[PDB]
Design a protein around this ligand. Structure first.
Ligand SMILES: CCCCCCCCCCCCCCCCCC(=O)O
Ligand SMILES: CCCCCCCCCCCCCCCCCC(=O)O
Lengths: 249, 292, 240, 45, 292, 240, 45, 249, 48
């Protein structure tokens, strides 16, 4: 009637073990699934590279500091240039997949702090304008802030999620905390959420993956200062259709 | 027959959850108060397990909090001025249909990410002094790709296929029901992406977030007149949403909007909660303590 | 034709009138409806989701710091940690919550509330807190002795890092108005105060100050009534 | 005797609002976890 | 009873054709891709036979592409000016009924060769400033052979048999349903012949193509007045076609019309397709190639 | 009389409102309906009829010459013969087709397209063509190597003088807007290019240049939606 | 409950449009030939 | 499951053989038929001269040249002065019939070109006006262009079918190609199409019969230059009613 | 980043002080020669 603290996630040829885990969030209670023939629209037979792309990718490691604001990634964008998944996303026009995001952050029993790990669908990034009216360039964010790639982008104003919506209500999204006194990882399984059965993995980013330190990292002199945060993700039930020449962006 | 159908149309009441009676509990291993918020799940603690409650057969109705009732309320979505006086003797105007121009309708709509619905549009048109003389107006809906009018006499007003409504100002407000018109399965108030391929290295990057599945053409409005009338007409467009389906709820907007089609907040971020003196002050005087 | 007589209310336009209207596109069949995860059919399901309370809504506190309740090792006993009112529609800590923002769209609310406190200190830090909910009629309690006379919970820091304090629906009327202040304090809900049951004890070489995060939400018997227009955001000109 | 919820036009989207299908299922947002946690249990054991 | 009849009146949806799953085929003698366009038959090749398709249970509705729905849309067919001011103090006008005066209705109608239908005519009348004062108008339909009025007071307005409609300008637009009135089985938008015998050696030859089966008389309109009113009235006639039967579809007109009752194109023939630079240029930038 | 109340929409004239109207001629019986061959009941039956594509819509090409795709003996290998977009409502080669002209009367379309190529060279002329359909996202392919990565057919000239290249319905949305250009390139369909698989080989004493005729039409799963007014022909004055 | 497609006048041509008889038979324009050609066959053999 | 290349059409005392034939077009899938008593209106007993008029008439031969535009005929008009059919059309007021149009054009295996043979019902001929407003004579075509007789009339602007409609869509009509590499004939069986059961064979022309070279005729030096195009037609199920004095036009 | 593309295990230090990394039999031949080096690197097993 409870959840065990140890867990092991095996998909593809990758395996992730954790010994201080809270639980596994199944976003909106739906598992990732292939597109049913009742909901599909494209007539080309999709390709399903089962184990070559549905596997864990350790992508970026950010160092948690006491004055850190947080970072965010975009799920299809962060994997577009890595492994067999990136190739299929570049060679095919259409794409759909879920994922299992796994954020890892361990620290001693003498550190403290809490991260908010949330998976935000359609995480449209806002630009903060200096009250300028005449539709200046500073009215829209550049491409580096909308599609950060695999390095991610650190928040400018985490209080409003860089989107004008309050951070306090971000818990309405599938989320999980990394409380250093309780757990050292956060797992979120997210199904493919989109108004279309398939979509371009290059233009459209289905989910934003934010990691925001709510309670700042604090420790005393003598403890390890470099406390990293590693983001490992894995596509689930990924399909591709509409083969053509490989397109980078 | 269908008499049973029409009889079962009144809004049936479903009540809120009842509270069962409970007693004190003294033991170990049973801790309904201790939770683990890190799991991302809300606490499942009940009142019955934290205090001693009574049996309350709750009869408060919950039907008003449904998505339909929350949205099926006509709000202002567009103000169109048919200028026909002064420097602009047009007598017509083509308004791009976008329901994100006014805060009250916009904030409610952005509660959800995707929405699929039909709409009932109502047009409240009048002069500047609020009067409504008999003046024949034509509200033509121009779907995306249809030729847009460029004058009060151009051929597009023939409307041989475009749906068009003719109504005087003195008539009751015209009202039409519009289906769910979109190439997608649902309208998408938030589209984290770009409509076209490319480098997206532009200086402005105004195309970010513009999903053409939401762009549903224009509403062309004109006075059916032979020449200039010298009177400006204001058409207020009200949209009532029906047969609603919402997906992926979002946080309600906290910063003030700045532009129509983009989330863009000022650099002076306003706090979600109003400030108070300290963390231990509340403004509730209460009563006089019996024995301080 | 059929003899009829028009009654008052003819030609009016009621914005909340569920009636029929002629369709503009005959024979229109919309796009097929595919399954999208995450559909919600009632706003009450949203008010039951725990969201962060902005308890530290003090002047000078900026950004994410406003979401943290500071707790530290005390030099004296039975000290007040923090306090806030539990009126959801009132300007204050509940403004930052999903239940608090949906309540502002309705006139009256009903049902039990729920606040979950998460301690975010070191694993080595221990402590006990008394979180008391004082029903209406009394101001904020001045001492812990006065606060413990109401609905309260003694919270023990441990492996289970979260506790839930249910604010029971203790009211005279079946519903409370969302509006408060003035004569509308008749609908006041009460005050929640956090006291140090024992101290916040730490070993050597570990931070002596930590944070408590408060997550507010609604209970299963929560209800809203008389939908209205909110007062959260203002507008002075169209967004063109 | 109620005489309502009748559609006078041939197209179904012209009907009035469908206000007879109130459904409440908050589990997909409040308990989106894999291992169901009993209330009376310590969640992380 | 008839309750079953009224229940089965909603537009029932018939969907587009489904796509069945298919696989690769390697063999001889089975060539669904090779066709013979010389036979005059369109290719019967299916997607299933040229690529490897999936099973798509198509649910897109096809009901909107029917002839009825395509035509049952009221479009402008005539503009009648009842001149009663200036140099022409008539107060009446006799308009020859011809639906080939305006492009949008005309091009749609000429999609087919023969058409048999009923019509619903609507009259939108107003002054030049678009106002509609209470002014009694009489719209008399004068069938071919009935005596046509020659003044606002002549005896033909007694209408003892001619169908007549009396309506003020301030009233909602008058609307009447007109049956299929024609000596033939269907109206003929194209009549490759002459109405009468003879040598047809005239210099103009204006009778070519004029089939009297389509000529259905005149619509006489007047203001019911004792003298001149000094106000000009514009009557816009809108025709909605119902109970449609079309035969022998034709190519849609590509050249601009010039006259009402005749196909006549200018000597400067416009191309059906807009020009481009060369036969190997397309204006679609697409995305960035991954590895050029 | 019977108590009634008039609702909004009274006295309006909606041009697409299927209602009743009083008849002008009581007891009128129309002319009997005889059988006429060639009745059509749906416009989708018309879009499935193959009509000539105006592929050679280049500046300077006049008259019937605009309907011919020139093909000749090449001096090099893997050369581009012709290309065109497969957006039916877009200004271009599809304007000359019955499917292209009926599509302009509707807002959105769906389903597979169909192009039939007829070789009109000598009986002695042989050749092979690669006709490739490139799905959206890519510009027109620059080499035959890039074009063959999409949906393509290798066409062999022979006694069967015609081949059919089906443009499969490869789209993200269930429908595509007929309007294109600008942000509406989101609904672009792709590009069809014709390449020389092998050369165009002829014996002595026979023409070295021939023509290919392209006939475009719709497939069985073709559909149109949201009927509108076309933009093909304009008018500035009544035809009196 | 649909209450439509009712004629209030004695003459049948006064009724509304007849939009319940959608029929599709494209063979009379797409395959107007005498000898039916199978798809998988070479048309001229 | 295919169509044979050889064919023989026998009606009346005439027989047409072909050895390179594509198929036989049955316009709108309806065979020519006599007027049923349910659709007839005239009460006079019709005459049905079975084999004297329902027979193949070879009418005109036009020479296909490299710069040819095309030719058109009108079906009742082209037979009004030939054989027993012409007499019955002149002696009777009313007439109805189908036809089987057969266009013949053979060339060597070293020629090339393609004709478009279509049967256009109610082929109203347009005049091309030089942008003249005041209803001049040049606003309507003369009788020689509307009823060309048996010699036919060559197109002025084949691109618009001399009717303002695009040639590319003429395939919506019952048509057939004569591709010199594939076939040397085109057969179209057309039933009586008219809004009336009977009609005058003199005033009204039910069908226009166009032959337009889409791909121009090309050959090399040494081949036969004169490549003719012969039009042979045959009325089918022809009836006549309303006998009176013979009227020429 | 390059190493995680192969067979790997993420090891967490805790009360269970040991972890096992199985080197799967990923080979082309049914057997590998014990001798290695030179042309016998054809039988190399890989790197941990
Ligand atoms: C007769 C005139 C009737 C008017 C027809 C109105 C048609 C409106 C389309 C439906 C509106 C909802 C979709 C709006 C989405 C656009 C918002 C945005 O993203 O900016
Ligand atoms: C009370 C007044 C009512 C008006 C009666 C209108 C009667 C109209 C007749 C039906 C119109 C369709 C046939 C038009 C054909 C003429 C077109 C042409 O060939 O120029």
């Amino acid at each position: 009637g409870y959840s065990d603290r140890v867990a092991q996630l095996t998909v593809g040829n990758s395996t992730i073990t954790t010994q201080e885990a809270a639980n596994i969030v199944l976003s909106y209670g739906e598992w990732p699934e292939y597109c049913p023939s009742t909901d599909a629209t494209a007539v080309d037979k999709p390709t399903r590279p089962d184990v070559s792309v549905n596997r864990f990718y350790t992508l970026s490691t950010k160092s948690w500091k006491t004055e850190s604001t947080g970072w965010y990634w975009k799920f299809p964008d962060v994997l577009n240039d890595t492994g067999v998944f990136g190739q299929n996303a570049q060679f095919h026009y259409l794409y759909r997949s879920g994922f299992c995001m796994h954020v890892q952050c361990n620290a001693s029993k003498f550190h403290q702090g809490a991260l908010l790990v949330a998976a935000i669908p359609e995480f449209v990034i806002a630009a903060s304008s200096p009250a300028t009216k005449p539709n200046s360039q500073g009215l829209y964010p550049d491409f580096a802030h909308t599609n950060p790639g695999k390095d991610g982008q650190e928040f400018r104003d985490p209080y409003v999620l860089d989107a004008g919506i309050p951070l306090s209500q971000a818990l309405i999204f599938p989320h999980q905390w990394i409380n250093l006194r309780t757990n050292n990882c956060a797992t979120i399984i997210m199904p493919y959420i989109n108004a279309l059965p398939f979509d371009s993995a290059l233009n459209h980013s289905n989910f934003g993956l934010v990691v925001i330190p709510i309670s700042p990292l604090k420790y005393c002199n003598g403890a390890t200062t470099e406390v990293p945060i590693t983001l490992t993700i894995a596509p689930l039930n990924s399909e591709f259709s509409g083969l053509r020449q490989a397109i980078k962006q | 027959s269908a008499v049973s159908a029409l009889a079962d149309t009144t809004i049936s009441r479903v009540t809120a959850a009842n509270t069962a009676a409970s007693t004190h509990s003294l033991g170990t291993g049973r801790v309904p108060a201790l939770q683990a918020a890190e799991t991302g799940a809300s606490s499942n603690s009940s009142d019955e397990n934290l205090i001693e409650t009574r049996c309350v057969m709750n009869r408060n109705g919950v039907n008003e909090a449904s998505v339909e009732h929350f949205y099926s309320r006509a709000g202002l979505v567009g103000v169109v001025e048919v200028k026909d006086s002064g420097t602009s003797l047009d007598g017509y105007t083509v308004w791009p249909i976008d329901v994100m121009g006014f805060v009250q309708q916009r904030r409610k709509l952005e509660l959800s990410t995707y929405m699929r619905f039909d709409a009932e549009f109502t047009f409240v048109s009048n002069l500047n002094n609020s009067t409504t003389p008999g003046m024949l107006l034509q509200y033509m809906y121009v779907p995306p790709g249809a030729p847009k009018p460029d004058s009060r006499k151009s051929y597009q007003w023939q409307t041989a296929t475009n749906p068009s409504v003719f109504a005087k100002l003195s008539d009751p407000p015209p009202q039409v029901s519009v289906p769910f018109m979109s190439p997608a399965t649902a309208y998408q108030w938030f589209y984290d992406g770009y409509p076209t391929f490319g480098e997206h290295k532009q200086a402005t990057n105004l195309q970010y977030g513009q999903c053409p599945n939401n762009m549903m053409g224009h509403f062309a409005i004109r006075t059916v007149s032979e020449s200039t009338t010298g009177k400006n007409i204001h058409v207020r467009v009200y949209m009532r949403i029906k047969h609603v389906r919402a997906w992926v709820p979002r946080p309600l907007r906290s910063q003030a909007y700045m532009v129509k089609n983009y989330p863009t907040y000022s650099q002076t971020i306003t706090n979600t909660a109003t400030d108070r003196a300290s963390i231990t002050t509340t403004d509730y005087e209460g009563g006089v303590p019996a024995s301080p | 034709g059929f003899p009829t007589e028009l009654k008052p209310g003819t030609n009016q336009f009621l914005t909340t009138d569920d009636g029929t209207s002629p369709p503009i596109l005959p024979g229109f069949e919309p796009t097929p409806l595919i399954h999208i995860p995450g559909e919600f059919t009632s706003l009450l399901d949203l008010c039951q989701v725990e969201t962060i309370l902005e308890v530290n809504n003090t002047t000078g506190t900026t950004g994410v710091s406003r979401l943290l309740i500071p707790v530290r090792a005390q030099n004296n006993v039975d000290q007040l940690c923090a306090s806030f009112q539990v009126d959801p529609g009132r300007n204050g800590p509940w403004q930052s919550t999903m239940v608090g923002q949906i309540c502002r769209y309705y006139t009256q609310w009903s049902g039990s509330l729920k606040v979950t406190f998460m301690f975010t200190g070191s694993f080595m830090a221990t402590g006990k807190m008394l979180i008391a909910y004082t029903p209406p009629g009394s101001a904020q309690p001045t001492t812990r002795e006065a606060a413990m006379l109401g609905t309260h919970i003694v919270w023990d820091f441990g492996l289970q890092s979260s506790v839930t304090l249910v604010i029971p629906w203790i009211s005279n009327t079946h519903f409370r108005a969302v509006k408060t202040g003035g004569v509308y304090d008749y609908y006041a809900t009460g005050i929640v105060t956090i006291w140090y049951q024992t101290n916040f004890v730490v070993p050597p070489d570990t931070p002596t100050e930590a944070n408590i995060i408060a997550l507010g939400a609604a209970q299963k018997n929560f209800t809203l009534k008389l939908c209205k227009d909110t007062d959260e955001i203002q507008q002075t000109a169209e967004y063109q | 005797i109620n005489f309502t919820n009748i559609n006078y036009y041939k197209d179904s989207y012209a009907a009035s609002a469908s206000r007879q299908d109130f459904a409440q299922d908050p589990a997909k947002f409040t308990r989106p976890v894999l291992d169901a946690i009993r209330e009376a249990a310590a969640p992380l054991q």
